[PDB]
Design a protein around this ligand. Structure first.
Ligand code: XJI
Length: 293
């Protein structure tokens, strides 16, 4: 990871970036701020191109749709906690998800949003904003403190609070047992495994496949080919001063990257040529751009 350059907030003594995503066509870097702004930076020039008032509290997380038309945001306090923005011609709010502190798009066909409110998952239609499903089974709850509900790659399944759901029947098919207080887990992009903190479970048989100690208290994101996994341990900054890369096929670590600055977020471009990391220089949180490669 070869550092290239830094994006900082123009017209501020201290930078206040909290999260990052590349635009679908990688023209711009979208940066959320601690004041609820979404700032667009030209990747080539480093220049701030727009600053949009999205929330009345710090933005925590962003997700652009693959087709470039939509953006999800989540914030910290107050209402709405999450929202869907149109990215075509005029930047505007399409819908709000008032109660949900985290939101993701569906994966295969991006026609749905999944939101999380504590132990509960909400699925919404993108066009209508209507709530299609509520997924919560009190007999299977793990009550994970940092629960984040997610679709699998085919959108047939959801993981919510370590419970596997069949979306089509809206029935719980399996509870993965609780071995940590915080992390609820994700689907591997390979479609075969679920990664819940340090445990790698077989999605089909539910048997334990691997123990991966380095993943304890980590959030993860994959490169776009699903060959490399990035993990950063939750701790103020959401993360510590390091992230680790892993071989996605065998969960063996590749590199340990200590930036010696607390991390707020990281993202890669669709081509995985670039890595952007929000790093505290101080709060003075800048976006450092790296060559991957
Ligand atoms: N943009 C992404 O998805 C990437 C992801 N970033 C977050 O999860 C992230 C950023 N701020 N806060 C959070 C956060 C923290 C806890 C939870 Cl429960 C849910 C969250 F969204 C991530 C993954 C691996 C990493 F190495 C790093 Cl540094 C970041």
């Amino acid at each position: 990871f070869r550092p290239i350059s830094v994006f900082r907030e123009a017209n501020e003594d201290e930078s206040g970036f909290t999260c990052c995503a590349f635009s679908a066509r990688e023209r711009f870097l979208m940066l959320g701020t601690c004041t609820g702004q979404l700032k667009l930076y030209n990747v080539f020039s480093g220049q701030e191109e727009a600053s949009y008032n999205c929330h009345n509290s710090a933005i925590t997380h962003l997700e652009p749709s693959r087709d470039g038309s939509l953006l999800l945001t989540s914030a910290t306090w107050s209402q709405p906690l999450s929202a869907l923005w149109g990215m075509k011609s005029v930047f505007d709010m399409k819908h709000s998800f008032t109660e949900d502190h985290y939101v993701e798009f569906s994966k295969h066909s991006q026609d749905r949003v999944i939101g999380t409110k504590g132990d509960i998952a909400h699925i919404y239609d993108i066009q209508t904003g209507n709530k299609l499903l509520t997924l919560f089974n009190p007999d299977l709850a793990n009550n994970y403190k940092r629960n984040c509900a997610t679709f699998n790659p085919t959108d047939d399944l959801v993981l919510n609070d370590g419970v596997l759901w069949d979306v089509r029947s809206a029935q719980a098919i399996h509870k993965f047992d609780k071995f940590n207080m915080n992390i609820s887990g994700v689907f591997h992009p390979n479609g075969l495994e679920v990664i819940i903190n340090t445990e790698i479970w077989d999605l089909r048989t539910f048997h334990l496949l691997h123990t991966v100690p380095a993943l304890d208290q980590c959030r993860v994101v994959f490169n776009h080919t699903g060959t490399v996994m990035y993990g950063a341990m939750l701790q103020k900054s959401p993360f510590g001063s390091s992230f680790r890369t892993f071989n996605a096929t065998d969960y063996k670590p590749i590199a340990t990257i200590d930036v010696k600055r607390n991390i707020f977020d990281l993202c890669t471009d669709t081509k995985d040529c670039y890595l952007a990391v929000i790093e505290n220089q101080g709060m003075d949180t800048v976006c450092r751009l790296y060559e991957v490669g």
